[PDB]
Design an enzyme around this catalytic site. Structure first.
Site, PDB file in Angstrom:
ATOM      1  N   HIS A 196       0.856  -1.236   0.000  1.00 41.82           N
ATOM      2  CA  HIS A 196       0.000   0.000   0.000  1.00 41.82           C
ATOM      3  C   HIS A 196       0.876   1.265   0.000  1.00 41.82           C
ATOM      4  O   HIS A 196       0.410   2.330  -0.479  1.00 41.82           O
ATOM      5  CB  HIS A 196      -1.006  -0.030   1.159  1.00 41.82           C
ATOM      6  CG  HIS A 196      -2.128  -1.013   0.908  1.00 41.82           C
ATOM      7  ND1 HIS A 196      -3.461  -0.690   1.023  1.00 41.82           N
ATOM      8  CD2 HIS A 196      -2.094  -2.289   0.448  1.00 41.82           C
ATOM      9  CE1 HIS A 196      -4.208  -1.727   0.630  1.00 41.82           C
ATOM     10  NE2 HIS A 196      -3.405  -2.696   0.247  1.00 41.82           N
ATOM     11  N   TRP A 236       3.253 -13.292  -9.289  1.00 44.18           N
ATOM     12  CA  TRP A 236       4.320 -13.571  -8.339  1.00 44.18           C
ATOM     13  C   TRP A 236       4.165 -12.811  -6.999  1.00 44.18           C
ATOM     14  O   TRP A 236       4.401 -13.350  -5.880  1.00 44.18           O
ATOM     15  CB  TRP A 236       5.666 -13.217  -8.968  1.00 44.18           C
ATOM     16  CG  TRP A 236       5.935 -13.976 -10.272  1.00 44.18           C
ATOM     17  CD1 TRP A 236       5.384 -15.174 -10.677  1.00 44.18           C
ATOM     18  CD2 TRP A 236       6.872 -13.627 -11.263  1.00 44.18           C
ATOM     19  NE1 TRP A 236       5.917 -15.556 -11.891  1.00 44.18           N
ATOM     20  CE2 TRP A 236       6.810 -14.605 -12.286  1.00 44.18           C
ATOM     21  CE3 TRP A 236       7.738 -12.521 -11.429  1.00 44.18           C
ATOM     22  CZ2 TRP A 236       7.584 -14.530 -13.470  1.00 44.18           C
ATOM     23  CZ3 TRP A 236       8.532 -12.447 -12.606  1.00 44.18           C
ATOM     24  CH2 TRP A 236       8.457 -13.463 -13.605  1.00 44.18           C
TER      25      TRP A 236
HETATM   26 CA   LIG Z   1       4.047   5.742  -0.815  1.00 42.48          CA
END
Ligand SMILES: [Ca+2]
Ligand code: HEM
Ligand SMILES: [Ca+2]
Length: 315
Positions: free
Chosen positions: A47, A164
């Site tokens: 994130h 992956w």
């Molecule tokens: Ca960032």
């Protein structure tokens, strides 16, 4: 080089990581376990890093999800991330490393606690973030395959590299997809970095483990597992299906590709030739012991085979 407590590392600038290693293994990962805090830290690496778009901006793996938490934890795709951002923030304030170094360092140390895991290469020196990520750059479980591949492609990842990186869902659970059943995992071995995720997502969906109507949730093949609609589609889409199958019962490929593609993600926004390599500070992970398997009592007729070139293996 030999550090002050006698631990050694190839580049002396890395000595500063040893006290930070100890503090996180004790105080962030609850005594070096492969538990919720490691899974949350690994999700945080992505994130933070994926906030990177050639046309809109964001400095990638830069610590912006902590430095600008006020903005980035408002984005709906970051729901639930505020807990691990709050948990990491004091470590950054107390130690002498940038938030962008810390997030990737904590993610690599966390992964090394999980049997089957790898040491993700780790570089030291990212400067502090100077901009919040733009909005809308994090994939969601309810996005189509074409949307997810276009977003990941835009940050530099091909469709095989997406597959992956999704080995991360081998050590992973959901709290917000279905809030009535938080902590329900994506595979039967959320404490073990193995190929069960790629297996079990290929099974026919059977039931919803909590409530039936949740956005971005597909049917799961098992009462104790939850299935994202994104993983359900990626395992079956002709753009990714043969790659997804190829990871099954292929732990060497999972380990090789996950380390190299995680290092690429950890370096988005950065230039490795300006950083220092401190990969050798990451602990050595335990190895696997048990063989890959269908869930007991299931067979090949429960698998939705989706690769025309190659049949699903006999496990
Ligand atoms: Ca960032
Ligand atoms: C590629 C598209 C992706 C989508 C659509 C996606 C979606 C999600 C969703 C919806 C959750 C559950 C959040 C919750 O409700 O609590 C999640 C969890 C998680 N994801 Fe992904 N993900 C993707 C890629 C990645 C990548 C590249 C990583 C690599 C680090 C990652 C690592 C994790 C981990 C470790 C968890 C478990 C978090 C925990 O147990 O605390 N995901 N993912
Ligand atoms: Ca697993």
């Amino acid at each position: 080089a030999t550090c002050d407590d006698g631990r050694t590392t190839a580049n002396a600038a890395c000595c500063i990581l040893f006290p930070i290693l100890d503090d996180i293994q004790e105080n962030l990962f609850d005594g070096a376990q492969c538990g919720e805090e490691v899974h949350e830290s690994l999700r945080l690496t992505f994130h933070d890093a994926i906030g990177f778009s050639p046309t809109l901006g964001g400095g990638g793996a830069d610590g912006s999800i902590i430095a600008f938490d006020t903005i980035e934890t408002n984005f709906p795709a970051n729901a639930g991330i505020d807990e691990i951002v709050s948990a990491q923030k004091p470590f950054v304030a107390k130690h002498n490393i940038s938030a962008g170094d810390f997030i990737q360092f904590a993610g690599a140390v966390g992964v090394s606690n999980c049997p089957g895991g790898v040491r993700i290469p780790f570089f030291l020196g990212r400067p502090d973030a100077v901009a919040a990520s733009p909005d809308h750059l994090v994939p969601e479980g309810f996005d189509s395959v074409d949307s997810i591949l276009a977003r990941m492609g835009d940050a530099g990842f091909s469709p095989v590299e997406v597959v992956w990186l999704l080995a991360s869902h081998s050590i992973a659970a959901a709290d917000k997809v279905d809030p009535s059943i938080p902590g329900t995992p994506f595979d039967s071995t959320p404490e073990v970095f193995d190929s069960q995720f790629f297996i079990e997502t290929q099974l026919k969906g059977r039931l919803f483990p909590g409530t039936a109507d949740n956005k971005g949730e597909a049917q799961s093949p098992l009462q104790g597992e939850i299935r994202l609609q994104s993983d359900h589609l990626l395992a079956r889409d002709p753009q990714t299906a043969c790659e997804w199958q190829s990871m099954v019962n292929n732990q060497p490929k999972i380990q090789n590709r996950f380390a190299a593609t995680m290092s690429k993600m950890a370096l988005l926004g950065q230039d490795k030739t300006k950083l220092i390599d401190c990969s050798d500070v990451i602990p050595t992970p335990p190895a696997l012991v048990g063989a890959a398997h269908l869930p007991a009592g299931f067979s090949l007729s429960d698998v939705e085979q989706a690769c025309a070139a190659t049949p699903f293996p006999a496990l």
